């Protein structure tokens, strides 16, 4: 779909999920936008190391 979905300035309306605490089961969908703690610390608020 390089004729329908690509833009000369880049199209960024399409996303994937890069992080998750667990792999999802067959035909599941995850709408969550919770922040992913990759470190051993917890974190609170919108972003962190």
């Amino acid at each position, epitope marked *: *779909s390089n*004729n*329908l*979905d690509s*833009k*000369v*300035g880049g*199209n960024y*309306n399409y996303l994937y999920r890069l992080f998750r605490k667990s792999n999802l089961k067959p035909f599941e969908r995850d709408i969550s936008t919770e922040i992913y703690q990759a470190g051993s610390t917890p974190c609170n608020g919108v972003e962190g190391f």
Partner: antibody
Amino acid sequence: QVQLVQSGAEVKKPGASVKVSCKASGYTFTGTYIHWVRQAPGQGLEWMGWINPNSGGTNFAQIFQGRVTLTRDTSISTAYMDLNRLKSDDTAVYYCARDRVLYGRSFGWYFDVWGAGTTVTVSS
Amino acid sequence: DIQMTQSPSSLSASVGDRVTITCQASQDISDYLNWYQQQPGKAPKLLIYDASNLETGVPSRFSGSGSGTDFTFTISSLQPEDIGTYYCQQYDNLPTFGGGTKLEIKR
């Protein structure tokens, strides 16, 4: 049989507010964007507003920011624009129109069908 | 902002005569331009999208061409139903509209 209907004529003072409705029918309202446009008498088309009937995500032309509110009623298949602190040149024909369901590009806005038009009048 | 300039204020032409209407942009829109008509006292109607593709159920004697900065809308013959006002709209950043070329019959 896609039919797009709007509220009738409105008579308003300068500095006041006006709410114009956009009743969808013949298709699933949550399937595509609704765009708002307005044509002043003897003038060119003027876009200002777009609102995703599924998400409620909303965006504007810069000169209408803080003046126009766009909203939607998925239960009643109806979009609305609500316009505040009405200027004398807010006197225009206003339209809602629909973004493309079929064989376009994924960004493109378009106006495949337009409502009956609402003739809002602002005067002292 | 992205300015749509459009050069004819109004056009006078006869039945069977060719019409070309020009729209142009401040920078490369690449392909991201749509064309419409409005008939007198009635709402707008889409004719060409993606600077080239003809709308469903509209007669083949409408045409569209051009890319990058500049875009041309074309009619082979302005039969009296085509009379009205013609608008281009870009989509590279927000919808923005051209001037509004009127059609007039050459009598």
